[PDB]
Amino acid sequence: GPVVEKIAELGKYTVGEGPHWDHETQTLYFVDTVEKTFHKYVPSQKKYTFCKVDKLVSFIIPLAGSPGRFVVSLEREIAILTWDGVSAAPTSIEAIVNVEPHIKNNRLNDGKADPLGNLWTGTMAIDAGLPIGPVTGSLYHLGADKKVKMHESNIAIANGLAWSNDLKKMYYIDSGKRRVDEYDYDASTLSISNQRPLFTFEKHEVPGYPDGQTIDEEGNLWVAVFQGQRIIKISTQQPEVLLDTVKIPDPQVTSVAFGGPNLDELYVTSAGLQLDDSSFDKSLVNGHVYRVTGLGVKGFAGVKVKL
Numbered sequence: 001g002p003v004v005e006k007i008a009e010l011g012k013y014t015v016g017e018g019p020h021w022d023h024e025t026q027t028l029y030f031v032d033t034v035e036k037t038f039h040k041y042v043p044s045q046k047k048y049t050f051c052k053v054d055k056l057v058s059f060i061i062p063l064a065g066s067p068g069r070f071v072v073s074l075e076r077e078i079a080i081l082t083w084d085g086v087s088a089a090p091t092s093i094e095a096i097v098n099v100e101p102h103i104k105n106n107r108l109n110d111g112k113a114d115p116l117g118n119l120w121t122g123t124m125a126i127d128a129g130l131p132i133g134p135v136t137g138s139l140y141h142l143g144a145d146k147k148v149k150m151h152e153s154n155i156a157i158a159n160g161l162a163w164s165n166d167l168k169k170m171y172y173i174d175s176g177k178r179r180v181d182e183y184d185y186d187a188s189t190l191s192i193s194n195q196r197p198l199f200t201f202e203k204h205e206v207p208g209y210p211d212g213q214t215i216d217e218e219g220n221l222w223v224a225v226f227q228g229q230r231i232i233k234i235s236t237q238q239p240e241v242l243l244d245t246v247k248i249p250d251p252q253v254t255s256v257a258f259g260g261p262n263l264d265e266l267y268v269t270s271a272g273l274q275l276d277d278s279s280f281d282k283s284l285v286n287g288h289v290y291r292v293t294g295l296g297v298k299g300f301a302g303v304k305v306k307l
């Protein structure tokens, strides 16, 4: 089957997350959502660097047309970070907008640009919990004149996002619902409607919780399963179709991104954070980064945020 390789040079992460593959520089960026640090990995040169800040972070995406600048989350703020990619702190930080100025215990979580370059991101309680905890998150996109628009609320744990190739569908994961939802996506108005379940974990005996996701060129979704020790491949052509399962040694798989020179290697982040309600003993929970080859599919390069 597919070959799953632990990336030794990268070490262990508390909650590694938000992988972004920059295809022109052949570079993987990612975050640790509890340790307040950004990470850069260049596989062809075996080069690893990091950057520390003093706010919780959850995504890092290159700014379109601005080498050396990134759009990031800092607690509840969307900001532009200027970073040379090697120094241990940012050169400067430019705040764009605070998405929830008066919800003091919320944070931004997963964020991703749609194929047109619009940033989408969701919030959640800092003390959110599974299976039950405070439900306080919403789904936003960053639109004209640096103002956000709200598209969904009552989100427990805002997580992975993806869009179909023809720009008619959006896929979204609230981990607390243990399902992947699909929406009709209107690219001209950037609005979503007709929410319905695409894939429900309970119907297929899939353990754990859906976390990050990414779509391949054939339109299949690859979904990280937190507390599932796996990634799964699900159809977008028909509801409730499990196409394949790939086991990952780390139980707490958090996200996925296609990368490599031909976009046919799947990079997989995980969490070493040891939780008190785990289905897995502490010795199993490490937080390594993995590379999966031999999946027989290609993905897309990560999209830069347009501002």
Ligand SMILES: [Hg+2]
Residues within 6 Å of the ligand: 038, 051, 060, 070, 072, 081, 082, 083, 090
């Ligand atoms: Hg950074």
Ligand SMILES: [Mg+2]
Residues within 6 Å of the ligand: 017, 110, 158, 159, 160, 211, 212, 254, 255
């Ligand atoms: Mg996530």
